[PDB]
């Protein structure tokens, strides 16, 4: 209301708007590179999925359906994969995924099953540490365009815990890239059910020179690993899109606040000039 502090406020909010526009355009660039990486990685999973379809079609014996093919009965312990942005300002994406993880944990505890969560990205790790349930395995400081080696550190741990019986079922929650405006979480399983990509449309009997057991033992870890990679990369694209949208909204809000503060400053200036002129006129009289 002093006509000078309001000028400082306008300057600060204008700086906020400018830095936010910078954030928006850089985030748009990152979102586009991430979408390009998603497209480039798509063919590998696109091929492995029908491989899983055919292998699942061939392997029907429950006894020979070992490793990740054991639909173990009397579920006790389940593991979940949560992927979060490394940094904030992502909008409501982190709130959505963390709420989804929380309701997942509550539902699993309702069934009496112990749960364990591995966190991708610092925000998930910090949230789960603050809740009081320490994650077993964490992989933070993940790059914008991560390599599959980065996700191996959690994937191999999860599958080792799966094989040893420590965990019975494996799930993953990630920010699905529905559209550049909406990025909702999506739950997926990592216990290959029937590979419903194209069901069993293809029917060609293959020879397993390593052997059925060896083939499945080698391929299923790879399939779950590429599924995790796809989820993480989709989540990165969703993160960049959500940050871009959040910064666009923040810039618009900053400009609206600039307009409001300019109106207030103008009113303050007019009032100050009126007080000035009235006082000098009264002093004249």
């Amino acid at each position: 209301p002093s006509s000078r502090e309001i000028k400082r406020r306008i300057r600060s909010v204008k700086n906020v708007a400018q830095i936010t526009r910078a954030m928006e355009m850089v985030s748009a660039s990152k979102m586009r590179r991430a979408q390009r990486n998603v497209l480039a990685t798509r063919p590998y999973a696109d091929r492995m999925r029908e491989v899983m379809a055919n292998l699942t079609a061939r392997v029907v014996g429950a006894a020979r359906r070992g490793t990740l093919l054991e639909k173990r009965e009397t579920v006790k312990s389940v593991a979940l994969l949560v992927v979060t942005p490394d940094r904030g300002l992502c909008g409501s994406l982190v709130a959505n995924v963390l709420r989804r993880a929380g309701r997942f944990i509550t539902e699993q505890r309702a069934m009496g099953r112990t749960v364990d969560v591995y966190t991708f990205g610092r925000k998930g790790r910090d949230f789960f540490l603050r809740t009081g349930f320490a994650p077993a395995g964490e992989a933070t400081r993940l790059g914008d365009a991560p390599k599959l080696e980065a996700i191996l550190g959690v994937a191999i741990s999860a599958i080792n815990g799966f094989q040893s019986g420590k965990y019975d079922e494996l799930y993953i929650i990630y920010s699905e890239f529905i559209n550049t405006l909406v990025q909702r979480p999506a739950i997926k399983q990592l216990l290959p059910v029937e590979s419903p990509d194209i069901s069993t449309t293809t029917n060609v009997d293959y020879t397993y020179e390593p052997g059925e057991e060896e083939v499945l033992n080698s391929i299923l870890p790879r399939y779950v690993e590429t599924q995790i990679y796809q989820a993480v990369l989709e989540s990165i694209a969703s993160e960049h899109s959500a940050r871009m949208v959040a910064m666009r909204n923040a810039t618009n809000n900053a400009k609206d606040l600039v307009r409001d503060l300019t109106l207030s400053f103008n009113k303050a200036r007019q009032a100050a000039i009126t007080k000035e002129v009235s006082e000098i006129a009264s002093g004249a009289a």
């Binding site: 830095i19 526009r21 910078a22 850089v26 660039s29």
Partner: protein, 129 residues
């Protein structure tokens, strides 16, 4: 000469928010920001040092065209100073020629164009940055 300068400075002012993010951007935007920074460093001037019209025309002809791109930004002022000294001592005729036909309707005539291009190329070859 100065239409290009005005346009490039306006472009830089539009994107001036990315000085601390210039490297982490598109190639074209990085080029625009680099050119804008070079021009702004070029417009710095000490005190009691007026530049005659032909000198300013030559400097802006150099800057607008892709000549200072090789030059690092912090040394643009030194580049201008010693390039001017070079023109004064090495090529007085170029300065005289620029001054003589300053009023021409089409200033970048072939003779003044080639003389200035030769002078600036010679200076860039002789000097190191």
């Amino acid at each position: 000469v100065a239409g290009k300068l005005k346009g490039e400075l306006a472009q830089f002012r539009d994107l001036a928010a990315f000085a601390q993010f210039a490297s982490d951007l598109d190639a074209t935007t990085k080029a625009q920001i680099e050119r804008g920074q070079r021009l702004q460093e070029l417009l710095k001037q000490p005190q009691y040092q007026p530049l005659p019209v032909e000198d300013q025309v030559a400097v802006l002809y150099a800057a607008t065209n892709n000549y200072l791109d090789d030059v690092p930004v912090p040394l643009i002022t030194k580049w201008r100073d010693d390039f001017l000294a070079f023109l004064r001592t090495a090529h007085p005729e170029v300065r005289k020629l620029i001054y003589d036909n300053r009023l021409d309707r089409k200033f970048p005539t072939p003779e003044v164009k080639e003389a200035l291009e030769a002078a600036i190329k010679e200076f860039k070859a002789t000097s190191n940055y």
